[PDB]
Design a protein around this ligand. Structure first.
Ligand SMILES: [Br-]
Ligand SMILES: [Br-]
Lengths: 250, 252
């Protein structure tokens, strides 16, 4: 069964498509505001629900980085039936997936919008859980890192430990592919992040092969920005990004 | 069936143990100079055959980073059966497992000697194979990077594509664990390496919380240095290291 508010969200629109990716332990709902704003300028929109996500933490414990990347690729396929121009955006690990997609498929995307991309967790305590024989099955969850008041994120309350390695792999693979990313990039990174070291934003800026790159520092937001109060601005600045580079409908 | 010369080297001795890890697509053969060195200098030694290695690329293609960490763990526990002072050394990915181990088990190790740790491969092309749906099953292997005329390593001829990710995972976990390695380290990086970027050494020396750390440049060898010209120099410099830090080594 799928937890309520965490169903996947695919709107049919023009020949312009946006792939919108949620994060680790999270669901599309953290993304549901942003995906909706795209589906309303008419774009075709795919917001997949990653394997193991939005159901049970035990099912996530059995999900791999191969699964999640396959979920992204199925979402592209779906989009590529309906579109000649594609774009991707994601949050956190979903932002690491964005950097991965643009690099795996150097030519597929017209531009990307990584927000708080989980490239380098920079946390030794997390790495100690990746291959630790004696670790407990569950740990406290990492969600709701938001400045706004009363704003909850629907994300698992536990971090299933045997999935941690996979988060690290996507971050690492993504970082190693930075040189190949050629498309325009609007990198979105909170000034203060308690989950992901915001040096990730600058890592990306210096790393990518793109000559059409801009870093946008958030200011009244923490990690889960798409739900924050700096969020309306993201949707806004994102749309102006799509337009400048798509050149279609628009 | 295990290919000739790739069997593990499990040698008994004193109360001081050395675990010795080989690399990716590699086997013990590439570590047999070192190990037989240590066994000879008294110490108990474990030189495991990493899961999927030294048999067939197809078996390796089915093996994971979980398997390989668990293999190092199993060997480590085999030493603990007979030992109370432990040391780790490995080549390449074996290097990263060494750094991983030191960080995973902060208290467990008297010292580490990572040789050309495969922490950051820094190759876009290899990354684009990590999760490639339409990549072939096999690519040309990476073995035998040796400055020394006439010297050949026993590594698979191919690199199985599905195992590539696990190589990167290990490298990245190790990297993230550097702050927690606090034990004495002899960091042995080649100056000319065509498999792992040689700036990896530097990445380690400035990375560890260890306070007893030494960076040692090799100058007459490539990546697979445990066989190069300097294999002798390494064995020797490592014994000094073990002897320096254990003090339970009395050897005539
Ligand atoms: Br492409
Ligand atoms: Br320990």
């Amino acid at each position: 069964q799928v937890l309520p508010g965490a169903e996947p969200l695919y709107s049919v629109g023009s020949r312009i498509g946006v792939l919108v990716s949620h994060g680790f332990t999270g669901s599309p709902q953290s993304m549901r505001f942003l995906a909706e704003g795209f589906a309303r300028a008419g774009y075709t929109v795919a917001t997949p629900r990653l394997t193991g996500h939005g159901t049970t933490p035990a099912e996530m414990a059995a999900s791999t980085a191969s699964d999640w990347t396959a979920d992204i690729v199925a979402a592209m396929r779906w989009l590529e039936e309906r579109c000649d121009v594609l774009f991707m955006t994601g949050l956190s690990m979903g932002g690491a997936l964005t950097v991965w997609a643009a690099g795996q498929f150097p030519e597929r995307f017209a531009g990307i919008m990584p927000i708080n991309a989980a490239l380098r967790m920079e946390s030794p305590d997390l790495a100690a859980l990746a291959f630790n024989p004696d670790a407990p099955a569950e740990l406290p969850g990492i969600g709701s890192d938001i400045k706004a008041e009363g704003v909850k994120e629907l994300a698992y309350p536990v971090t299933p430990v045997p999935a941690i390695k996979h988060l690290i792999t996507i971050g690492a693979v993504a970082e190693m592919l930075l040189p190949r990313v050629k498309c325009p990039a609007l990198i979105i990174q909170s000034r203060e992040d308690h989950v992901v070291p915001p040096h990730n934003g600058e890592l990306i800026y210096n790393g990518i092969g793109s000559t059409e790159k801009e870093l946008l520092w958030l200011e009244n937001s923490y990690h889960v920005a798409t739900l924050d109060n700096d969020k309306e601005l993201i949707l806004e600045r994102s749309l102006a990004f799509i337009r400048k580079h798509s050149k279609l409908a628009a």
